[PDB]
Amino acid sequence: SMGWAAAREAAGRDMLAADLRCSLFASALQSYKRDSVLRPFPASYARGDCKDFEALLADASKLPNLKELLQSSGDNHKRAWDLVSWILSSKVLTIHSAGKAEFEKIQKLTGAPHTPVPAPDFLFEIEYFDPANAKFYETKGERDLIYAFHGSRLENFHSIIHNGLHCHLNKTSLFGEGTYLTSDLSLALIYSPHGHGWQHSLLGPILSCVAVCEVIDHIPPKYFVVTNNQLLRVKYLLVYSQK
Ligand SMILES: O=c1[nH]ncc(-n2cc3ccc(OC4CCNCC4)cc3c2)c1C(F)(F)F
């Protein structure tokens, strides 16, 4: 993972994106489903197979807000900087705050809404690095990209960002295999109830989040299903902050 000085620079470049990542980490950690949804898990809190969730919950509770972490601390917050450095580290991707200009663009790409939908409070774009970025464009070849929504409980988004959407392979289920997506945000939103994020977040403590996926083309509103995880990636996050 990045060292502290590098993490401080990365967080300073985009405080809201860094905050989002700390918020989604807190949501996955605080969930009763932490065992399955906090993946990836920070290795410094694991003894081989044994994940020390109580030590991690305690240290997450001691994190100051990101403004305090950056503006004073250098060696005032050793454990905090170790954890936040890990949260903000990835060789695969990074996240960028985007403007309400970008929400219009998302509507243009997904379709004019058939149903009234709320505008997100925050919008983020995921940028992929190689090899994952080149691999996705290799898989795409000349096929078109379509943009579709996938709602989920807040405590799944740490895993969704780092691992992609779960593409279930269970012929043993009512819903069968695949990832469900829709071009109607009002249908995706039903799958994105408010959850608890981070009490020290710039975004606010209570968030809903909807993924916008890039899919390689290959009443109620209409949904579709993708069974091959190489054919989609999460490209945007729509974040709604409860008032
Ligand atoms: O955003 C989403 N987040 N998670 C789930 C999900 N999704 C939509 C569904 C519609 C219907 C259905 O029902 C089955 C269909 C087969 N037969 C038995 C019932 C399951 C769905 C799961 C969506 C969406 F809208 F993008 F697709």
Structure described in brief:
It is a single-pass type IV membrane protein. The protein is α+β, with helices and mostly antiparallel strands. The protein contains ten helices and ten strands.
Structural notes for this entry:
It is an enzyme of class 2 (transferase). Its main location: endoplasmic reticulum. Its EC number is 2.4.2.-. Belongs to the ARTD/PARP family. It comes from Homo sapiens (Human). With 243 residues, the chain is an alpha+beta fold. It has one domain. Strands 3, 4, 5, 7, 8 and 10 form a 6-stranded antiparallel beta sheet that branches. A two-stranded antiparallel sheet has the order 1-2. Strand 1 and strand 2 form a beta hairpin. Helix 1 packs across helix 2. The longest helix is centred in the first third of the chain and has 16 residues. The two termini are 35 Å apart. The protein binds the ligand O=c1[nH]ncc(-n2cc3ccc(OC4CCNCC4)cc3c2)c1C(F)(F)F. The ligand O=c1[nH]ncc(-n2cc3ccc(OC4CCNCC4)cc3c2)c1C(F)(F)F binds next to strand 5, strand 6 and helix 10.
Keywords:
243 residues, alpha+beta, six-stranded antiparallel β-sheet, two-stranded antiparallel sheet, 10 helices, 10 strands, 36% helix, binds ligand T9D, transferase, ADP-ribose, artd15, ARTD Transferase domain
Topology at a glance:
Elements: H1 4-13, H2 15-30, H3 34-37, E1 46-47, E2 50-51, H4 53-61, H5 66-71, H6 78-88, E3 93-98, H7 100-110, E4 122-128, H8 132-140, E5 145-152, H9 157-163, E6 179-182, H10 185-189, E7 195-196, E8 206-216, E9 223-226, E10 232-241
Antiparallel strand pairs: 1-2, 3-4, 4-10, 5-8, 6-9, 7-8, 8-10
Helix pairs in contact: 1-2, 1-6
Bound molecules: the ligand O=c1[nH]ncc(-n2cc3ccc(OC4CCNCC4)cc3c2)c1C(F)(F)F.
Keywords: ADP-ribosylation, Endoplasmic reticulum, Glycosyltransferase, Membrane, NAD, Nucleotidyltransferase, Transferase, Transmembrane, Transmembrane helix, Unfolded protein response
GO cellular component, one term: endoplasmic reticulum membrane
Modified residues (ADP-ribosyl aspartic acid): 35
